[PDB]
């Protein structure tokens, strides 16, 4: 792929997408509804299953 030709093709094709308001950016949405980690437990029991799948995770890094 050539960079200049892809620039020209993208400006012709994808040039009409709307811009973004500053108040509705990705960072504002991340601040408005943040992630919360809760230490908890769930199992989904089945009466006649064969396998036993399980995952244990800790709160990791962004």
């Amino acid at each position: 792929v050539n960079h200049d030709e892809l620039v020209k093709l993208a400006s012709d094709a994808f040039g009409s997408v709307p811009d973004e308001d500053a108040a509705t950016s990705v960072r504002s949405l991340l601040v408005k509804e943040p992630s919360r980690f809760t230490g908890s437990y769930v199992h989904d029991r089945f009466p006649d299953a064969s396998e036993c799948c399980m995952a244990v995770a800790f709160k990791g890094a962004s």
Binding site: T38, G39, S40, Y41, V42, H43, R45, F46, P47
Partner: protein, 70 residues
Amino acid sequence: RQNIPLREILYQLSPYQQDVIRQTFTNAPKTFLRFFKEKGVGLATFGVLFFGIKGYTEHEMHQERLAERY
């Protein structure tokens, strides 16, 4: 170890994500009244039988002591 067929979803919360003894003060009068509502009849029939038979026996013993007097 005794396979049990069952279908469920179980949820559990960490013991460091909830309180320990704060609800114990709210539920204490209700639990007191519920305990006496559940065990009221048995405790009452126990008390009636024990104290009635004891009182009748002690009364008749006192009458027996009085009958020996001159």
